[PDB]
Design a binder for this molecule. Structure first.
Ligand SMILES: CC(=O)N[C@@H]1[C@@H](O[C@@H]2O[C@H](CO)[C@@H](O)[C@H](O)[C@H]2NC(C)=O)[C@@H](O)[C@@H](CO)O[C@H]1O
Ligand SMILES: *[C@@H]1O[C@H](CO)[C@@H](O[C@@H]2O[C@H](CO)[C@@H](O)[C@H](O)[C@H]2NC(C)=O)[C@H](O)[C@H]1NC(C)=O
Ligand SMILES: O=c1ccn([C@@H]2O[C@H](COP(=O)(O)OP(=O)(O)O)[C@@H](O)[C@H]2O)c(=O)[nH]1
Ligand SMILES: *[C@@H]1O[C@H](CO[C@H]2O[C@@H](C)[C@@H](O)[C@@H](O)[C@@H]2O)[C@@H](O)[C@H](O)[C@H]1NC(C)=O
Ligand SMILES: C[C@@H](O)[C@H](N)C(=O)O
Ligand SMILES: [Mn+2]
Length: 267
Protein backbone atom coordinates (compact mmCIF):
# COMPACT_ATOMS: atom_id res chain seq x y z
CA UNK A 1 0.00 0.00 0.00
CA UNK A 2 3.04 2.20 -0.44
CA UNK A 3 3.10 3.01 3.32
CA UNK A 4 6.37 4.70 4.32
CA UNK A 5 5.55 4.34 8.04
CA UNK A 6 3.36 1.79 9.83
CA UNK A 7 2.53 1.44 13.59
CA UNK A 8 3.67 -1.68 15.45
CA UNK A 9 0.34 -3.22 16.36
CA UNK A 10 -1.47 -6.51 15.80
CA UNK A 11 -5.23 -5.95 15.66
CA UNK A 12 -5.61 -9.69 14.91
CA UNK A 13 -4.02 -10.58 18.30
CA UNK A 14 -5.76 -7.84 20.33
CA UNK A 15 -8.57 -6.19 18.35
CA UNK A 16 -8.76 -2.60 19.61
CA UNK A 17 -12.14 -1.34 20.61
CA UNK A 18 -11.52 2.26 19.48
CA UNK A 19 -8.82 3.49 17.07
CA UNK A 20 -8.14 7.25 16.94
CA UNK A 21 -6.75 8.59 13.64
CA UNK A 22 -5.47 12.14 14.17
CA UNK A 23 -4.85 14.58 11.28
CA UNK A 24 -1.98 17.05 11.84
CA UNK A 25 0.58 18.74 9.59
CA UNK A 26 4.32 18.08 9.99
CA UNK A 27 4.89 21.32 11.90
CA UNK A 28 2.20 20.59 14.57
CA UNK A 29 4.43 18.57 16.89
CA UNK A 30 3.12 20.60 19.84
CA UNK A 31 -0.43 19.42 19.01
CA UNK A 32 0.60 15.80 18.74
CA UNK A 33 2.47 15.89 22.05
CA UNK A 34 -0.45 17.52 23.84
CA UNK A 35 -2.70 14.72 22.44
CA UNK A 36 -0.22 11.99 23.40
CA UNK A 37 -0.25 13.42 26.95
CA UNK A 38 -4.09 13.75 27.07
CA UNK A 39 -6.98 11.96 25.27
CA UNK A 40 -4.61 10.17 22.86
CA UNK A 41 -2.94 8.22 25.72
CA UNK A 42 -3.40 4.52 25.04
CA UNK A 43 -5.14 2.60 27.81
CA UNK A 44 -8.01 0.28 28.58
CA UNK A 45 -11.28 2.25 28.90
CA UNK A 46 -13.82 0.12 30.81
CA UNK A 47 -11.74 -2.86 29.75
CA UNK A 48 -11.72 -1.85 26.04
CA UNK A 49 -8.51 -1.09 24.19
CA UNK A 50 -7.87 2.44 22.89
CA UNK A 51 -5.19 2.98 20.23
CA UNK A 52 -3.97 6.32 18.79
CA UNK A 53 -2.16 7.06 15.52
CA UNK A 54 -1.23 10.27 13.65
CA UNK A 55 -1.78 10.60 9.90
CA UNK A 56 0.98 12.35 7.99
CA UNK A 57 2.03 12.70 4.37
CA UNK A 58 5.36 14.05 3.13
CA UNK A 59 6.86 17.50 2.77
CA UNK A 60 9.63 18.98 0.67
CA UNK A 61 11.28 20.48 3.79
CA UNK A 62 14.29 18.35 4.70
CA UNK A 63 14.16 19.62 8.30
CA UNK A 64 10.54 18.62 8.84
CA UNK A 65 11.26 15.32 7.13
CA UNK A 66 14.04 14.49 9.57
CA UNK A 67 12.09 15.61 12.67
CA UNK A 68 9.11 13.48 11.66
CA UNK A 69 11.45 10.55 11.02
CA UNK A 70 12.78 10.93 14.58
CA UNK A 71 9.22 11.29 15.93
CA UNK A 72 8.14 7.97 14.27
CA UNK A 73 11.27 6.31 15.70
CA UNK A 74 10.60 7.60 19.25
CA UNK A 75 6.76 7.07 19.34
CA UNK A 76 5.97 4.42 16.66
CA UNK A 77 2.43 5.82 16.19
CA UNK A 78 2.62 7.52 12.76
CA UNK A 79 0.84 6.29 9.60
CA UNK A 80 2.57 7.83 6.54
CA UNK A 81 2.30 7.61 2.74
CA UNK A 82 4.16 9.66 0.11
CA UNK A 83 1.78 12.52 -0.62
CA UNK A 84 2.35 16.26 -0.30
CA UNK A 85 0.85 17.01 3.15
CA UNK A 86 -1.13 20.21 2.35
CA UNK A 87 -4.67 21.51 3.20
CA UNK A 88 -6.01 20.54 -0.30
CA UNK A 89 -4.57 16.96 0.11
CA UNK A 90 -6.61 16.23 3.30
CA UNK A 91 -8.84 13.86 1.26
CA UNK A 92 -5.70 11.72 0.50
CA UNK A 93 -4.75 11.79 4.22
CA UNK A 94 -8.20 10.60 5.33
CA UNK A 95 -8.24 7.89 2.64
CA UNK A 96 -4.73 6.83 3.93
CA UNK A 97 -6.21 6.27 7.44
CA UNK A 98 -9.23 4.38 6.05
CA UNK A 99 -6.85 2.31 3.87
CA UNK A 100 -4.75 1.56 7.00
CA UNK A 101 -7.80 0.31 8.93
CA UNK A 102 -8.80 -1.84 5.93
CA UNK A 103 -5.35 -3.40 5.33
CA UNK A 104 -4.00 -3.65 8.93
CA UNK A 105 -6.85 -3.24 11.45
CA UNK A 106 -10.16 -4.47 9.98
CA UNK A 107 -10.84 -5.91 13.45
CA UNK A 108 -11.32 -2.43 15.07
CA UNK A 109 -14.83 -2.23 16.46
CA UNK A 110 -14.84 1.56 16.08
CA UNK A 111 -12.65 4.21 14.43
CA UNK A 112 -12.68 7.97 15.06
CA UNK A 113 -11.07 10.34 12.53
CA UNK A 114 -10.22 13.61 14.34
CA UNK A 115 -8.43 16.92 13.93
CA UNK A 116 -5.62 18.11 16.23
CA UNK A 117 -7.29 21.27 17.72
CA UNK A 118 -9.76 19.10 19.57
CA UNK A 119 -10.79 17.76 22.97
CA UNK A 120 -12.08 14.11 22.87
CA UNK A 121 -13.81 12.38 25.82
CA UNK A 122 -13.08 8.70 24.96
CA UNK A 123 -14.64 7.59 28.29
CA UNK A 124 -18.06 9.08 27.43
CA UNK A 125 -17.74 8.06 23.73
CA UNK A 126 -16.98 4.45 24.78
CA UNK A 127 -20.03 4.51 27.08
CA UNK A 128 -22.41 5.83 24.37
CA UNK A 129 -21.01 3.32 21.79
CA UNK A 130 -21.54 0.31 24.15
CA UNK A 131 -25.18 1.51 24.46
CA UNK A 132 -25.86 2.17 20.73
CA UNK A 133 -25.98 -1.60 19.94
CA UNK A 134 -24.84 -0.38 16.43
CA UNK A 135 -21.79 -2.50 15.40
CA UNK A 136 -22.01 -2.52 11.55
CA UNK A 137 -22.64 0.15 8.87
CA UNK A 138 -22.46 2.73 11.73
CA UNK A 139 -21.37 6.36 11.13
CA UNK A 140 -21.88 9.30 13.46
CA UNK A 141 -20.63 12.75 14.53
CA UNK A 142 -21.96 16.29 14.03
CA UNK A 143 -24.43 15.63 11.23
CA UNK A 144 -24.42 18.19 8.36
CA UNK A 145 -27.57 17.37 6.32
CA UNK A 146 -28.53 20.10 3.79
CA UNK A 147 -25.20 21.82 3.24
CA UNK A 148 -24.58 24.12 0.30
CA UNK A 149 -21.09 24.29 -1.23
CA UNK A 150 -19.24 27.50 -0.34
CA UNK A 151 -18.82 29.55 -3.53
CA UNK A 152 -17.18 32.59 -1.75
CA UNK A 153 -13.80 32.48 -3.71
CA UNK A 154 -11.42 33.35 -0.85
CA UNK A 155 -13.17 31.12 1.76
CA UNK A 156 -11.09 28.30 3.29
CA UNK A 157 -13.76 25.82 2.15
CA UNK A 158 -14.30 27.35 -1.30
CA UNK A 159 -15.04 24.90 -4.13
CA UNK A 160 -15.60 26.01 -7.70
CA UNK A 161 -18.43 24.71 -9.80
CA UNK A 162 -15.85 22.59 -11.66
CA UNK A 163 -14.62 21.03 -8.42
CA UNK A 164 -18.18 20.36 -7.24
CA UNK A 165 -20.90 21.17 -9.80
CA UNK A 166 -24.07 20.53 -7.76
CA UNK A 167 -26.21 22.84 -5.51
CA UNK A 168 -26.08 20.72 -2.34
CA UNK A 169 -23.60 18.31 -0.70
CA UNK A 170 -24.61 14.79 0.30
CA UNK A 171 -25.19 14.17 4.01
CA UNK A 172 -21.90 14.20 5.88
CA UNK A 173 -20.37 14.75 9.31
CA UNK A 174 -17.94 17.49 10.43
CA UNK A 175 -14.32 16.42 9.74
CA UNK A 176 -13.49 17.85 13.20
CA UNK A 177 -14.28 14.38 14.54
CA UNK A 178 -16.42 11.51 13.32
CA UNK A 179 -16.81 7.86 14.30
CA UNK A 180 -17.59 4.72 12.31
CA UNK A 181 -17.75 0.95 12.72
CA UNK A 182 -14.43 -0.58 11.50
CA UNK A 183 -16.24 -2.47 8.66
CA UNK A 184 -17.18 0.92 7.07
CA UNK A 185 -13.43 1.52 6.37
CA UNK A 186 -13.26 -1.45 3.98
CA UNK A 187 -16.47 -0.41 2.20
CA UNK A 188 -15.38 3.25 1.78
CA UNK A 189 -11.92 2.19 0.52
CA UNK A 190 -13.60 -0.17 -1.98
CA UNK A 191 -15.97 2.44 -3.46
CA UNK A 192 -13.55 5.42 -3.12
CA UNK A 193 -12.09 5.29 -6.67
CA UNK A 194 -15.63 5.22 -8.20
CA UNK A 195 -16.82 8.39 -6.36
CA UNK A 196 -16.34 11.96 -7.70
CA UNK A 197 -13.29 13.34 -5.91
CA UNK A 198 -13.63 16.43 -3.77
CA UNK A 199 -10.83 18.18 -1.81
CA UNK A 200 -12.99 18.51 1.34
CA UNK A 201 -12.34 15.11 3.12
CA UNK A 202 -15.57 15.03 5.19
CA UNK A 203 -17.70 15.72 2.07
CA UNK A 204 -15.85 12.98 0.12
CA UNK A 205 -16.50 10.39 2.87
CA UNK A 206 -20.15 11.54 2.74
CA UNK A 207 -20.17 10.85 -1.01
CA UNK A 208 -18.79 7.34 -0.35
CA UNK A 209 -21.31 6.63 2.45
CA UNK A 210 -24.19 7.72 0.14
CA UNK A 211 -22.91 5.46 -2.62
CA UNK A 212 -22.84 2.65 -0.02
CA UNK A 213 -26.36 3.40 1.28
CA UNK A 214 -24.95 3.95 4.79
CA UNK A 215 -27.22 6.37 6.63
CA UNK A 216 -25.83 8.84 9.21
CA UNK A 217 -27.07 8.48 12.78
CA UNK A 218 -27.00 10.74 15.84
CA UNK A 219 -24.89 9.08 18.56
CA UNK A 220 -27.16 10.15 21.45
CA UNK A 221 -30.36 12.00 22.29
CA UNK A 222 -28.27 15.00 23.26
CA UNK A 223 -25.58 16.81 21.12
CA UNK A 224 -22.11 15.34 21.83
CA UNK A 225 -20.06 16.74 18.90
CA UNK A 226 -19.29 20.50 18.92
CA UNK A 227 -17.48 21.75 15.74
CA UNK A 228 -18.38 25.30 16.91
CA UNK A 229 -16.54 24.96 20.22
CA UNK A 230 -17.89 25.42 23.74
CA UNK A 231 -17.61 27.42 26.98
CA UNK A 232 -15.53 25.09 29.21
CA UNK A 233 -16.92 23.50 32.39
CA UNK A 234 -15.82 20.23 34.04
CA UNK A 235 -19.43 19.02 34.22
CA UNK A 236 -20.12 19.89 30.55
CA UNK A 237 -16.89 18.23 29.31
CA UNK A 238 -17.78 15.05 31.28
CA UNK A 239 -20.98 14.71 29.17
CA UNK A 240 -19.62 15.41 25.63
CA UNK A 241 -17.52 13.45 23.07
CA UNK A 242 -15.76 16.18 21.05
CA UNK A 243 -15.07 19.92 21.14
CA UNK A 244 -13.18 21.93 18.47
CA UNK A 245 -11.22 25.24 18.66
CA UNK A 246 -8.87 23.95 21.38
CA UNK A 247 -5.18 24.89 21.18
CA UNK A 248 -2.45 22.72 22.81
CA UNK A 249 -1.93 24.79 25.95
CA UNK A 250 -5.70 24.92 26.38
CA UNK A 251 -6.04 21.13 25.88
CA UNK A 252 -3.47 20.37 28.64
CA UNK A 253 -5.24 22.83 31.01
CA UNK A 254 -8.65 21.20 30.37
CA UNK A 255 -7.20 17.69 30.90
CA UNK A 256 -5.66 18.88 34.20
CA UNK A 257 -9.04 20.36 35.24
CA UNK A 258 -10.76 17.00 34.63
CA UNK A 259 -8.03 15.16 36.62
CA UNK A 260 -8.12 17.78 39.42
CA UNK A 261 -11.88 17.33 39.78
CA UNK A 262 -12.12 13.57 39.15
CA UNK A 263 -14.25 12.10 41.94
CA UNK A 264 -16.34 15.17 42.49
CA UNK A 265 -20.02 14.89 41.66
CA UNK A 266 -21.93 16.81 39.01
CA UNK A 267 -25.58 17.97 38.82
C1 LIG B 1 -17.06 25.99 11.85
C2 LIG B 1 -18.23 25.57 11.02
O1 LIG B 1 -19.13 24.88 11.49
N1 LIG B 1 -18.23 25.97 9.75
C3 LIG B 1 -19.35 25.87 8.83
C4 LIG B 1 -19.05 24.99 7.63
O2 LIG B 1 -18.57 23.72 8.01
C5 LIG B 1 -17.56 23.36 7.13
O3 LIG B 1 -18.14 22.95 5.90
C6 LIG B 1 -17.17 22.46 4.96
C7 LIG B 1 -17.92 22.24 3.67
O4 LIG B 1 -18.38 23.48 3.18
C8 LIG B 1 -16.53 21.21 5.56
O5 LIG B 1 -15.61 20.63 4.65
C9 LIG B 1 -15.79 21.63 6.82
O6 LIG B 1 -15.12 20.54 7.42
C10 LIG B 1 -16.76 22.25 7.81
N2 LIG B 1 -16.08 22.79 8.97
C11 LIG B 1 -16.22 22.31 10.20
C12 LIG B 1 -15.38 22.98 11.25
O7 LIG B 1 -16.97 21.38 10.47
C13 LIG B 1 -20.28 24.91 6.73
O8 LIG B 1 -21.37 24.36 7.46
C14 LIG B 1 -20.70 26.31 6.29
C15 LIG B 1 -21.98 26.38 5.51
O9 LIG B 1 -22.36 27.74 5.38
O10 LIG B 1 -20.92 27.10 7.47
C16 LIG B 1 -19.70 27.20 8.17
O11 LIG B 1 -19.65 28.32 9.01
C1 LIG C 1 -1.08 16.10 -3.29
O1 LIG C 1 0.02 15.21 -3.24
C2 LIG C 1 0.38 14.75 -4.55
C3 LIG C 1 1.41 13.67 -4.36
O2 LIG C 1 2.51 14.15 -3.62
C4 LIG C 1 0.88 15.95 -5.35
O3 LIG C 1 1.22 15.54 -6.67
C5 LIG C 1 2.55 15.70 -7.02
O4 LIG C 1 2.86 17.08 -7.05
C6 LIG C 1 4.22 17.35 -7.40
C7 LIG C 1 4.41 18.84 -7.28
O5 LIG C 1 5.76 19.18 -7.02
C8 LIG C 1 4.49 16.83 -8.81
O6 LIG C 1 5.86 17.04 -9.13
C9 LIG C 1 4.19 15.35 -8.87
O7 LIG C 1 4.33 14.87 -10.20
C10 LIG C 1 2.78 15.04 -8.38
N1 LIG C 1 2.61 13.61 -8.36
C11 LIG C 1 1.44 12.98 -8.25
C12 LIG C 1 1.47 11.68 -7.52
O8 LIG C 1 0.40 13.45 -8.70
C13 LIG C 1 -0.20 17.00 -5.44
O9 LIG C 1 0.28 18.18 -6.07
C14 LIG C 1 -0.71 17.36 -4.05
N2 LIG C 1 -1.85 18.25 -4.18
C15 LIG C 1 -1.85 19.54 -3.85
C16 LIG C 1 -3.21 20.16 -3.69
O10 LIG C 1 -0.82 20.18 -3.68
O1 LIG D 1 -1.29 20.14 5.70
C1 LIG D 1 -2.11 19.97 6.60
C2 LIG D 1 -3.03 20.95 7.11
C3 LIG D 1 -3.87 20.62 8.10
N1 LIG D 1 -3.89 19.37 8.66
C4 LIG D 1 -4.83 19.02 9.74
O2 LIG D 1 -6.13 18.94 9.20
C5 LIG D 1 -7.09 19.51 10.11
C6 LIG D 1 -7.79 20.67 9.45
O3 LIG D 1 -6.94 21.84 9.53
P1 LIG D 1 -7.56 23.15 10.22
O4 LIG D 1 -7.66 22.91 11.68
O5 LIG D 1 -6.79 24.34 9.78
O6 LIG D 1 -9.01 23.14 9.52
P2 LIG D 1 -10.55 23.55 9.79
O7 LIG D 1 -10.91 23.27 11.21
O8 LIG D 1 -10.64 25.01 9.46
O9 LIG D 1 -11.35 22.71 8.84
C7 LIG D 1 -6.30 19.84 11.39
O10 LIG D 1 -6.36 18.76 12.31
C8 LIG D 1 -4.89 20.06 10.86
O11 LIG D 1 -3.92 19.72 11.82
C9 LIG D 1 -3.05 18.37 8.22
O12 LIG D 1 -3.05 17.25 8.69
N2 LIG D 1 -2.19 18.74 7.21
C1 LIG E 1 -29.06 -1.90 23.75
O1 LIG E 1 -29.31 -3.22 24.19
C2 LIG E 1 -29.44 -3.27 25.62
C3 LIG E 1 -29.34 -4.72 26.03
O2 LIG E 1 -30.59 -5.41 26.06
C4 LIG E 1 -31.35 -5.64 24.95
O3 LIG E 1 -30.74 -6.41 23.92
C5 LIG E 1 -31.40 -6.26 22.64
C6 LIG E 1 -31.08 -7.49 21.83
C7 LIG E 1 -32.90 -6.04 22.85
O4 LIG E 1 -33.62 -6.49 21.71
C8 LIG E 1 -33.38 -6.78 24.10
O5 LIG E 1 -33.17 -8.18 23.96
C9 LIG E 1 -32.67 -6.26 25.33
O6 LIG E 1 -33.47 -5.32 26.03
C10 LIG E 1 -30.73 -2.55 26.00
O7 LIG E 1 -30.88 -2.55 27.41
C11 LIG E 1 -30.65 -1.11 25.50
O8 LIG E 1 -31.88 -0.43 25.70
C12 LIG E 1 -30.31 -1.06 24.02
N1 LIG E 1 -30.14 0.33 23.64
C13 LIG E 1 -30.65 0.89 22.54
C14 LIG E 1 -29.87 2.04 21.99
O9 LIG E 1 -31.69 0.50 22.02
C1 LIG F 1 -18.07 30.21 7.61
C2 LIG F 1 -19.04 29.62 8.61
C3 LIG F 1 -18.46 29.39 10.00
N1 LIG F 1 -19.45 29.74 11.04
C4 LIG F 1 -17.19 30.17 10.19
O1 LIG F 1 -17.18 31.19 10.86
O2 LIG F 1 -16.19 29.72 9.64
MN1 LIG G 1 -9.59 22.72 13.26
Amino acid sequence: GNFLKLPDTDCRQTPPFLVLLVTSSHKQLAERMAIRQTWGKERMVKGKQLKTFFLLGTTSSAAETKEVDQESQRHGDIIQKDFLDVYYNLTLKTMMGIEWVHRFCPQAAFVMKTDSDMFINVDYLTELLLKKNRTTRFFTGFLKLNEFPIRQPFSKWFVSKSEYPWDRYPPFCSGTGYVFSGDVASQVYNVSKSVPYIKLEDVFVGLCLERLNIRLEELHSQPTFFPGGLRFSVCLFRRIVACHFIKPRTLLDYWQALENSRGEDCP
